[PDB]
Write a protein that binds this ligand. Structure first.
Ligand code: CDL
Ligand code: CDL
Ligand code: PLX
Ligand code: PLX
Ligand code: PLX
Ligand code: PEE
Ligand code: PEE
Lengths: 56, 459, 57, 42, 53, 347, 98, 70, 121, 107, 140
């Protein structure tokens, strides 16, 4: 029964929500470390015709 | 890395908000899911490391330890669910909270890109373990054990902190990457000798070293089943991880300073293996076996060769799993018998055959039977020590002989012979205990198929 | 006899933990055992003042 | 003992919280505007 | 520690008595007015370490 | 006493401390100290009994002697330089006398004897005020003249204070004596970094004040003054015992609790000035404080002591008077380690 | 530094030592405190008058007044202590022990 | 399939590590420089830090003092 | 670094005017989130001590706790950032004004530097 | 000696409770049969079915980020080049000595 | 004060055994007198004669302990022909501890004193060699 089992089974959504939030926060921290994107001597590359960044 | 930390933090709200009769199910399910998530860290590179951010990074030495730490929590919950049956909901939730906090601290400790953060989490892991030992313990000596398990650790760890900050004043950075890339040789000086000692003894006390192993039998005996599991499986490996991380700056002074600890470990392995032979307690015998294995790991780390490090990593993983299984089996016997003495209950193979099979497999994997990863680590360390010096083989072989002797002694005393007549409360083993044994043993025999997953960064 | 009782249970216990416990207990007893007479504390303060004046200059 | 929810205290608490939040948002907006002005961003 | 309420408010609660050369009643000079005056103008704003050396 | 009289005396104490803090003249600092001491005595003797009177007279004797030597040091400094401003002390004989006076005012060793006696004699609220508020003025004066202190004497007194507190706290069954020895040890930690960084001194003062406020308020809530009386607290308010154990672990310097923040930073600072032996000795000595904190925690919450039959009646009543700032104090004294860099605010 | 200042400091130190001797008679502790105050007043007055610090003439009297107030307080306390025991002997205050 | 749906390319980690190393190296050099600056300022006192107060010279009264020689 | 005597310092100013030239901390700063979490924990402890339903006793009281903690944390973060900016500014200015005490090291490659080798045996 | 020989009023030590007596098929998880059975089911499904199987298959088929086959192919092509060119396989010096500047002794 | 420190330190380690022994005896006597004064102030045992006997006993023990340490350290340094070696200080300190135990007449006390002041003397020698500062001035 909806709106009844939710009051008892709503705790099961906490961990997956934490997981997706952690993935979002990992991307959050990743976005701040692009000072050398497409600048290392090993992977100096010319951009593709429809490409703006090598990795996101 | 937050994809693992955040679910572990959300495990707390879930437990507290959980129904009064649904805490164990939710905790076990979500802990297993978090272990599945953490399984992704095994995909390492032959290059430097998995640098997620400025605060956390992963490595093929940290990855197996993290996987084992995430895997241990469901087993700990399954083991603890039995003896906490007559316990109030608030205090059961507090127990689960302590377990979750310990897992979170260990997970953050094993990444620890900076050494001061590593020290902070490495000493933060102390509080939940002390609370678990001194609160949910049976005997009156638990308090004493807790005191020991505390002060020994601090007696080694307080100087380390000083050394750590001193290094940051000289080097300018305690980040592991900068420390590795900018490492400089240590001049053979008294000041450098004392800095070496301050950096080393903090991790040597927790392995533990043979001289400083007194706290371990007390802490393991008086702690509950979950406390014994977490102490034997993961908490002992913190010293080895710290030593492997910190020995980079200690060269070349390590060559001269390794001699006392090498001698102490090489003789204390024999001493503890012989002590195991004359023991009237199962938990104490398992604790002394753990001491012997960690002494071998200390020898491996001090030898400081690639094969040494590979064998050390494999041995830590294998020993953690094996000791957790042995403690679980001993606790299953104790819950029926309530005496914790080897000679009291005998001939249990007649009454509990499947549990006897579990006992046999645990004893065999503790005996370092090939091609188990226990044997892989032991053989790698033995070969590295033989390359270090050809005379170590005598002590190593003696240790193997005594190890086999006491393992089969433990098996035969409790499983073989005639049953005790006056004991009649030996009920058939439950599905929970058998599932616990299977979940402990299957990963070992699966990891022996892919050894490179647990051989560390020097593979 | 040697491995279990002599070393593990007695001498290793005697050296690090028991000696520390005994020394700390003795020092705590010596320091805390003051009868509460301000005469002795004041004489000690005078001695300390004299030592500070005659030693730290 | 036997008492009803004190609506005076509840109203004071809600008003204090709302006023603090409004002041914080206004202060933040002013700070960003001032910093942009001094540093010549926009 | 030192909360300079006087300098914040310009009250001058006790600065009038701090030195000999600060507005004595009836313009009565200190015995060492000139030396104190010279030493004070020597060390004004220079800072304690540099003033000492 | 009359509540108006008590409020006036408390405001007089605070005004004396503020006068010490905001004045730039030595005579005004001495006057503020005199006012604080004058208004402190009736607060200590709020509950009339011979013990309170004895504690108050011991406190009066010690503080009067400290003020008198402070005045002598001021006079000698004026003699060797016609200066009344609080600055570098000029004379070295007047700087050693200025240090012992402030040490007896703070309670540092070897002038530590009066602290356990006075704390045990007075009640819990008077002990709270004495151990928290009475440290602001001498520490402020020391911070102002920090560059003039001889490091040898100050460091010797700090190390002696730490040793004496750690050793003397082991033998105590009374909670007030335990708190007094803890205060002595924390003052020893506080003054060991004055020659190097006063900001660390003020940070340690703030953390110690928060922890002491939380501890003393918890002791007031569970009205117990002995170990055995505190052992009965689990049977009525177990959450109070749990919070008390967490706070005690915090005062032991155990990470990741708040009490680890000062020590750590102090050690860090003292490693910048090529000092190694002293911080190591300080940590090894603070192990003793942690030991007796852990013994108290054992007797308090980690074990369930036997109770009494009459306790059942206490189950039917609730505390009429409640303390508003206790939860905030507990949280600040337990969970502010991640906020360490905020110490750059020159607290 | 002339000999007069040295002798005054010596008198102050002797009074402090007598205060710290504590043979008996807490009244003698109060008397030693008052002697220390008298030595301080004498030294401060001599120093201030010698250097013609005109405003600092406020300093001695203030000190005097404050100290006398302190003395009064102490006297009151002593009376109360005596009011419990009947004598002002120091050794009677042994209920509190470290 | 696993590499496509779970893991990013090799360059990502390479350049992220390069940036992290650059940041940490700057932090280390700044720490040494700050320590040296602190030492120099405390020793000499000419710097903005460690400025201990002295007597304000605006308090001096510049007027005839009933005696020609001050 | 003792900035008590730094020239041109207003005595009792929490945040000087020049601090307005620095970027303010974001409203989503993790430190502000931690301060709000501390306020929430204080509210939970307040509910627990007074023997009330911990999670759902006073919503207004808990929300006031969180709001006050966030307010004080924001202003504290502002002051902390200003102080660190001042420290870096002073250090850079002192380095610039004293070139003789901070010489430019000669750049040498590892191919021309002889470092002793210690074999592991 | 009128003492009751009882140190204090204490509850008697309770006997152990058997999960099998009140409920066969007890599974050793809980005293409530439905919660017990569901606990067993979720333990078996998330331990043996999800982690032990899917995780093992995931680890078995992890991509070659360790660069084993890449190193093998590089060595294959490098040996093919050196053998054809007559070069003496792997050189003794890991770096070209021409770009290493020794410090002249002149002793 | 530091006059005794200067007198003890100025003498070379490898020469003048008697002067080093005299300086160490003076330092030990001063330390024992200080300990006796502290004990008398904190605990007046029974009388003036008992107090002066206690002070004499403590002073002789400490002076005695010091004398044994100085003679042994200097002799070991001279015969071993290797000055500035903490092993000589360890030997001298532990011999002094053995003499202290003999005075106290306790085997366990003697062994503990030997160990715990041999280590202390070795640490002091190491600090003198490497320039460790117990009371560091404010560098920064
Ligand atoms: C040999 C070829 C195998 C091919 C078939 C595949 C078999 C897969 C089995 C995997 C392991 C089993 C899981 C462990 C828990 C046991 C389960 C259980 O409870 O039994 C209930 C079940 C029902 O019994 P029940 O009647 O209801 O209960 C009565 C009581 O329980 C009374 O019980 P009991 O009296 O009947 O005793 C149970 C029995 C079985 O229980 C056990 O003790 C299992 C322990 C096995 C190993 C012990 C640890 C040592 C480390 C070895 C690690 C290697 C693992 C390799 C990868 C494994 C992948 C998971 O114990 C033994 O017989 C003693 C075994 C000792 C053998 C020592 C030799 C070891 C090295 C052998 C070579 C391995 C690599 C070969 C490489 C070169 C060739 C290619 O019994 C069984 O299923 C028996 C299992 C079959 C025997 C397996 C023993 C050899 C297998 C070695 C590992 C796999 C090798 C892979 C390829 C080799 C080629
Ligand atoms: C790395 C950081 C990350 C982790 C953070 C960890 C800390 C965080 C929390 C800090 C404190 C705040 C909360 C604690 C308040 C205490 C209240 C309490 O006792 O619990 C009862 C209460 C339930 O009981 P009740 O029905 O109200 O009535 C029972 C009475 O309260 C009382 O019943 P009783 O009196 O009959 O029971 C007696 C019992 C009761 O006594 C207690 O339980 C006292 C509480 C513990 C003391 C707390 C000290 C302050 C925090 C220190 C944390 C230390 C961290 C460092 C690690 C070392 C660990 C020590 O005492 C004993 O049994 C004596 C022996 C206990 C064993 C020895 C003491 C060890 C305790 C140490 C615990 C430390 C961690 C606490 C974790 C939270 C526990 C609630 O629990 C709760 O419901 C509140 C828990 C939290 C609420 C979660 C709601 C959030 C979910 C929705 C939002 C979703 C979030 C994500 C957003 C996005 C989603 C879409
Ligand atoms: C108790 C259970 C185990 C706990 C842990 C025990 C392990 C810790 C032991 C630490 C290792 C030894 C410490 C110093 C070793 C240095 C090598 C030395 O032994 O060799 C000679 C050193 O000579 C002598 O040993 C001098 C030192 C003698 C004083 C030490 C006391 C000896 C026994 C005390 C043991 C107590 C240790 C535990 C204390 C709590 C070489 O002479 P020299 O070439 O000139 O010196 C070379 C070093 N330099 C270059 C820096 C100068
Ligand atoms: C235990 C945790 C800390 C809690 C602290 C109490 C929190 C509530 C306090 C409420 C606000 C108090 C701030 C006062 C308002 C204006 C202050 C301003 O006028 O003063 C300025 C200075 O502001 C204050 O000093 C800053 C106080 C902020 C304290 C927070 C630091 C906490 C340490 C890090 C732990 C993290 C705690 C986070 C949660 C609270 C000017 O100082 P100045 O006259 O020029 O020199 C005197 C100081 N000297 C001598 C050291 C240089
Ligand atoms: C009951 C009696 C038996 C009945 C059943 C009969 C059937 C017998 C078959 C079972 C064993 C016989 C041996 C047959 C082995 C064949 C499978 C093997 O080849 O696969 C292995 C694969 O095994 C895995 O690699 C090892 C298992 C993963 C270990 C992770 C454990 C699971 C996570 C749980 C938590 C971890 C806890 C411990 C922390 C570390 C090795 O594969 P590999 O040659 O290399 O390359 C794979 C293919 N490539 C080339 C495309 C890449
Ligand atoms: C410089 C000073 C260094 C101080 C070092 C402090 C070490 C930390 C342990 C302090 C314990 C001191 C207290 C003590 O031992 O008291 C004796 C006490 C008596 O029991 P009580 O519960 O107090 O009362 C029973 C009667 N009703 O004995 C005990 O129970 C002790 C049991 C646990 C001992 C803890 C383990 C300590 C040893 C571990 C290593 C630490 C050694 C110190 C550093 C070594 C040097 C590097
Ligand atoms: C389970 C218990 C284990 C206890 C572990 C204790 C062993 C660690 C060593 C003792 C503590 C030393 C901490 C030093 C921290 C490192 C800092 C450092 O090494 O810097 C040195 C400082 O070195 C020291 O000062 C060390 C002096 C030791 C003082 C404390 C002694 C403690 C006991 C020593 C005897 C025990 C020795 C072996 C203990 C093994 C444990 C059993 C350089 O000093 P500077 O003045 O800066 O140099 C300038 C000139 N080049």
């Amino acid at each position: 029964n909806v709106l009844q089992i939710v009051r008892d089974h709503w705790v099961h959504i906490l961990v997956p929500v934490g997981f997706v939030f952690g993935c979002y926060l990992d991307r959050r921290s990743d976005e701040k470390l692009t000072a050398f994107r497409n600048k290392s001597l090993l992977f100096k590359r010319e951009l593709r015709p429809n490409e703006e960044v090598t990795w996101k | 890395m937050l994809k693992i930390i955040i679910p572990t933090t959300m495990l707390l709200p879930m437990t507290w908000m959980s129904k009064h009769n649904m805490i164990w199910i939710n905790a076990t399910v979500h802990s297993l899911l978090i272990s599945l998530i953490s399984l992704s860290l095994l995909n390492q590179l032959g290059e430097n490391s998995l640098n997620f951010s400025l605060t956390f990074f992963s490595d093929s030495l940290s990855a197996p330890l993290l996987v084992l730490t995430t895997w241990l929590l469901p087993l700990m919950l399954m083991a603890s669910q039995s003896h906490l049956s007559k316990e109030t909901t608030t205090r059961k939730k507090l127990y689960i909270t302590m377990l979750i906090l310990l897992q979170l601290f260990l997970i953050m400790t094993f990444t620890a890109t900076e050494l001061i953060l590593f020290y902070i989490l490495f000493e933060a892991t102390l509080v939940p373990t002390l609370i678990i030992i001194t609160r949910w313990g049976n005997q009156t000596e638990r308090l004493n054990a807790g005191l020991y398990f505390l002060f020994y650790t601090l007696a080694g760890s307080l100087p380390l902190l000083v050394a750590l900050v001193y290094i940051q004043n000289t080097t300018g950075s305690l980040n592991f990457l900068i420390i590795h890339y900018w490492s400089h040789p240590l001049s053979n000086s008294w000041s450098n000798i004392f800095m070496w000692l301050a950096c080393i003894m903090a991790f040597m006390v927790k392995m533990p070293l043979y001289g400083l192993h007194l706290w371990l039998p007390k802490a393991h005996v008086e702690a509950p089943i979950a406390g014994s599991m977490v102490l034997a499986a993961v908490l002992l490996k913190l010293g080895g991880y710290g030593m492997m991380r910190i020995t980079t700056i200690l060269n070349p002074l390590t060559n001269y300073m390794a001699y006392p600890f090498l001698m102490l470990s090489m003789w204390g392995m024999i001493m503890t293996s012989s002590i195991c032979l004359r023991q009237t307690d199962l938990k104490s015998l398992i604790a002394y076996s753990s001491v012997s294995h960690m002494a071998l790991v200390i020898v491996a780390i001090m030898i400081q060769t690639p094969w040494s490090f590979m064998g050390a990593t494999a041995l830590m993983i294998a020993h953690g799993l094996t000791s957790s299984m042995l403690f679980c089996l001993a606790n299953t016997n104790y819950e029926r018998v309530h005496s914790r003495t080897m000679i009291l209950a005998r001939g249990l193979q007649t009454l509990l055959p499947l549990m006897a099979t579990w006992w046999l497999v645990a004893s065999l994997t503790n005996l370092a039977l090939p091609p188990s990863i226990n044997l892989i680590g032991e053989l790698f360390i033995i070969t590295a020590s033989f390359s270090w010096s050809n005379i170590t083989i005598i002590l190593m072989g003696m240790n193997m002989m005594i190890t086999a002797l006491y393992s089969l002694y433990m098996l035969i005393t409790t499983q073989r012979g005639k049953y005790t007549h006056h004991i009649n409360n030996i009920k058939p083993s439950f599905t929970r205990e058998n599932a616990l044994m299977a979940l402990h043993i299957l990963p070992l025999l699966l990891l022996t198929l892919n050894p490179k997953m647990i051989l560390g960064p020097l593979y | 006899k040697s491995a279990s009782s002599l070393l593990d249970l007695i001498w290793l216990e005697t050296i690090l933990p028991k000696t520390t416990s005994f020394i700390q207990m003795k020092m705590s007893i010596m320091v805390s055992n003051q009868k509460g007479l301000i005469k002795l504390y004041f004489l000690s303060f005078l001695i300390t003042i004299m030592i500070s004046m005659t030693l730290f200059n | 003992p036997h008492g009803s929810p004190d609506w005076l205290k509840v109203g004071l608490t809600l008003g204090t919280s709302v006023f603090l939040w409004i002041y914080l948002i206004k202060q933040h907006k002013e700070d960003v505007l001032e910093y942009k002005r001094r540093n010549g961003l926009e | 520690p030192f909360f300079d309420v006087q300098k914040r408010l310009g009250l001058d609660l006790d600065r009038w008595m701090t030195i000999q050369s600060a507005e004595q009643p009836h313009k009565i000079p200190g015995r060492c007015h000139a030396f104190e005056k010279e030493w004070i103008e020597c060390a004004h704003g220079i800072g304690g370490i540099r003033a000492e050396k | 006493m009359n509540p108006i009289i008590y409020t006036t005396l408390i405001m007089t104490v605070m005004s004396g401390t503020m006068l010490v803090m905001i004045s730039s003249h030595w005579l005004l600092i001495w006057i503020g100290f005199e006012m604080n001491l004058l208004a402190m005595i009736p607060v200590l003797m709020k509950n009339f009994n011979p013990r309170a009177t004895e504690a108050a007279t011991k406190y009066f004797l010690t503080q009067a002697t400290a003020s008198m030597m402070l005045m002598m040091a001021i006079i000698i400094n004026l003699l060797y330089s016609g200066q009344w401003t609080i600055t570098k002390m000029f004379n070295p004989v007047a700087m050693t006398m200025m240090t012992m006076a402030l040490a007896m005012k703070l309670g540092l060793s070897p002038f530590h004897f009066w602290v356990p006696e006075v704390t045990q004699g007075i009640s819990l609220q008077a002990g709270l005020l004495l151990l928290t508020w009475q440290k602001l003025a001498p520490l402020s004066v020391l911070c102002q003249i920090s560059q003039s202190i001889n490091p040898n004497l100050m460091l010797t007194m700090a190390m002696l204070s730490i040793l004496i507190g750690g050793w003397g706290g082991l033998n105590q069954t009374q909670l007030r004596k335990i708190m007094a020895y803890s205060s002595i040890a924390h003052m020893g930690w506080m003054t060991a970094v004055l020659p190097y960084n006063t900001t660390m001194t003020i940070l340690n003062l703030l953390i110690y004040i928060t922890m002491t406020l939380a501890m003393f308020m918890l002791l007031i809530h569970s009205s117990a003054t002995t170990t055995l009386s505190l052992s009965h607290t689990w049977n009525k308010m177990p959450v109070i015992t749990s919070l008390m154990m967490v706070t005690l672990l915090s005062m032991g310097g155990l990470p990741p609790l708040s009490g680890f923040m000062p020590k750590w930073m102090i050690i860090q600072e003292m490693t910048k000035n090529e000092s190694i032996i002293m911080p190591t000795l300080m940590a090894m000595t603070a192990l003793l404080n942690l030991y007796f904190y852990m013994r108290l925690a054992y007797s308090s919450s980690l074990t369930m002591f036997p109770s009494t039959n009459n306790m059942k009646m206490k189950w039917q009543f609730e505390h009429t008077k409640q303390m508003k700032l206790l939860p905030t104090m507990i949280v600040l004294s337990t969970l502010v380690l991640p906020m360490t860099p905020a110490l750059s605010s020159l607290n | 530094m002339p000999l007069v200042y040295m002798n005054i400091i010596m008198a102050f130190a002797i009074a402090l030592a007598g205060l710290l001797m504590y043979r008996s008679h807490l009244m003698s502790s109060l008397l030693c405190l008052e002697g220390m105050m008298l030595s301080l007043f004498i030294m401060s007055t001599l120093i201030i008058l010698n250097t013609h610090f005109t405003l600092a003439n406020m300093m001695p009297i203030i000190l005097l007044v404050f100290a006398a107030c302190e003395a009064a307080l102490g006297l009151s306390l002593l009376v109360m202590v005596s009011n419990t025991y009947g004598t002002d002997y120091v050794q009677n205050l042994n209920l509190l022990q470290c | 399939w696993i590499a496509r749906t779970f893991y990013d390319g090799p360059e990502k980690n390479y350049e992220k590590t390069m940036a992290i190393l650059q940041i940490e190296a700057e932090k280390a050099e700044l720490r040494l420089k700050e320590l040296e600056v602190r030492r120099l300022m405390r020793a000499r006192g000419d710097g903005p830090w460690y400025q201990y107060p002295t007597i304000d010279k605006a308090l001096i009264d510049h007027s005839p003092k009933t005696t020609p020689d001050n | 670094t003792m900035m008590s005597g730094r020239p041109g310092r207003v005595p009792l100013q929490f945040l000087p005017n020049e601090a307005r030239s620095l970027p303010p901390p974001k409203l989503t700063d993790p430190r502000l989130v931690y301060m709000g979490f501390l306020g929430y924990c204080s509210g939970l402890i307040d509910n627990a001590i007074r023997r009330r339903p911990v999670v759902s006793a006073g919503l207004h009281r808990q929300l006031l706790y969180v709001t006050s903690f966030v307010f004080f944390g924001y202003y504290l973060l502002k002051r902390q950032d200003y102080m660190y900016a001042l420290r870096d500014h002073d250090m850079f200015a002192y380095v610039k004004s004293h070139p003789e005490d901070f010489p430019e090291k000669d750049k040498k490659t590892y191919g021309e530097i002889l470092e002793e080798f210690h074999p592991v045996r | 000696p009128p003492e009751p020989t009882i140190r204090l009023q204490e509850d008697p030590d309770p006997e152990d409770e058997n999960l099998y007596e009140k409920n066969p098929d007890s599974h050793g998880y809980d005293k409530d049969p439905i919660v017990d059975l569901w606990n067993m089911r979720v333990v078996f499904f998330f331990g043996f079915s999800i982690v032990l199987v899917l995780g093992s298959t995931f680890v078995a088929y992890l991509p070659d980020y360790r660069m084993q086959e890449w190193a093998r192919r590089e060595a294959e092509r490098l040996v093919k080049y050196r053998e054809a060119n007559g070069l003496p396989l792997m050189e003794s010096n890991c770096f070209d000595p021409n770009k290493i500047q020794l410090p002249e002794d002149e002793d | 004060a530091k006059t005794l420190l200067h007198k003890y330190s100025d003498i070379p380690e490898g020469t003048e055994c008697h002067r080093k022994a005299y300086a160490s005896t003076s330092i030990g006597g001063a330390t024992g007198l200080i300990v006796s004064a502290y004990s008398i102030a904190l605990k007046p045992p029974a009388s003036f004669l008992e107090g002066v006997a206690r002070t004499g006993r403590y002073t002789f023990t400490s002076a005695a302990i010091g004398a044994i340490f100085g003679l042994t350290s200097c002799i070991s340094a001279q015969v071993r022909e290797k000055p500035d070696d903490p092993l000589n200080y360890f030997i001298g300190g532990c011999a002094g501890g053995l003499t202290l135990g003999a005075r106290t007449r306790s085997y366990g006390i003697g062994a503990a004193a030997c160990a715990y002041m041999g280590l202390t003397a070795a640490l002091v020698k190491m600090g003198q060699l490497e320039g460790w500062q117990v009371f560091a001035e404010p560098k920064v």
